[PDB]
Amino acid sequence: MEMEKEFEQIDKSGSWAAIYQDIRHEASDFPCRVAKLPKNKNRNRYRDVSPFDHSRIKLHQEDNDYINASLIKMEEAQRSYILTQGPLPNTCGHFWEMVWEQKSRGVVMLNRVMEKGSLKCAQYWPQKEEKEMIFEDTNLKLTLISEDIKSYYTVRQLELENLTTQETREILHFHYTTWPDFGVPESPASFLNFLFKVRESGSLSPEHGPVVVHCSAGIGRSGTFCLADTCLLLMDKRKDPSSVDIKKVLLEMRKFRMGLIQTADQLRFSYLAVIEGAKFIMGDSSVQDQWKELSHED
Numbered sequence: 001m002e003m004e005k006e007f008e009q010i011d012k013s014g015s016w017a018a019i020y021q022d023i024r025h026e027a028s029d030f031p032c033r034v035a036k037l038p039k040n041k042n043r044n045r046y047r048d049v050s051p052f053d054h055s056r057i058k059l060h061q062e063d064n065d066y067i068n069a070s071l072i073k074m075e076e077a078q079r080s081y082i083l084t085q086g087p088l089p090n091t092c093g094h095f096w097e098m099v100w101e102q103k104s105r106g107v108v109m110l111n112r113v114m115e116k117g118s119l120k121c122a123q124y125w126p127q128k129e130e131k132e133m134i135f136e137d138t139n140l141k142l143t144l145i146s147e148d149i150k151s152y153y154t155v156r157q158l159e160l161e162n163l164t165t166q167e168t169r170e171i172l173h174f175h176y177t178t179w180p181d182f183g184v185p186e187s188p189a190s191f192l193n194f195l196f197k198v199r200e201s202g203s204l205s206p207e208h209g210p211v212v213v214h215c216s217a218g219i220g221r222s223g224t225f226c227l228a229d230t231c232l233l234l235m236d237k238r239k240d241p242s243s244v245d246i247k248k249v250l251l252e253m254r255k256f257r258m259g260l261i262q263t264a265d266q267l268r269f270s271y272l273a274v275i276e277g278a279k280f281i282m283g284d285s286s287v288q289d290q291w292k293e294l295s296h297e298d
């Protein structure tokens with residue numbers, strides 16, 4: 001019943017794979033007609049990762065309205081998120097147009113541009129103050145104002161300008177730079193410290209448009225972030241924080257975008273994250289670092 005006691009039983013039985021396969025079989029199926037049009041082929045990273053028609057974000061400019069991006073509206077938790085793929089070389093302008101039009105304050109990135117020698121996302125933001133980016137197709141300018149590089153994540157201040165009007169906005173870029181090449185993090189401490197920094201910035205407040213969250217495909221790591229955040233919000237709002245069933249929250253999220261959480265390891269990490277996050281919020285600091293054995297395994 002208590003989330004933590006369910007966790008212990010699933011670990012003892014080795015039943016993470018079976019639970020993850022039940023989720024896959026139970027998940028919603030809705031049409032993705034627009035994503036599958038032939039003119040949109042070069043706007044999708046993968047043929048089998050598409051936004052549903054009912055929840056897709058529409059671009060407003062005169063032109064093709066299509067971006068691979070979904071609005072996740074969690075009504076009981078009172079938060080929304082846009083989940084999207086990492087931009088491609090030809091959809092960086094579309095990505096910033098969406099940020100502009102939806103009034104987002106924050107962008108959350110859960111991957112590196114290159115991983116295991118392969119390109120996972122385009123370089124969609126400027127690395128140097130003095131070398132701004134212009135997106136000619138969507139008439140947007142983007143400048144790096146500052147950045148703060150820490151061991152597990154980096155936080156940037158960006159200035160986004162609509163060149164049609166000369167209106168400008170400050171956008172916060174939260175970049176988790178240490179997700180492992182294979183699997184999931186051993187400990188959720190650094191992920192939680194990252195989530196709490198995002199919250200602390202004000203970027204998730206209802207004063208703003210939905211935060212934009214992405215990885216490479218916009219379903220696996222991205223899913224973990226949004227699922228952890230929403231379960232923690234529900235634990236604070238409910239009379240009994242043990243009422244929170246992670247599996248039922250995840251199926252709810254999957255009405256808005258397919259494939260959220262892509263492996264049994266991602267499922268187990270999300271549970272671990274919520275359990276530790278709740279402990280921390282309730283007054284246990286021992287969860288905020290990982291203890292290391294003296295070893296030289298590499």
Ligand SMILES: Cc1cc(C)n(-c2ccc(N)cc2)n1
Pocket residue numbers: 073074075078079080203204205206207208209210211
């Ligand atoms: C559903 C629902 C109800 C509310 C207040 N939001 C929401 C939308 C956007 C942000 N940034 C925060 C919250 N989503």
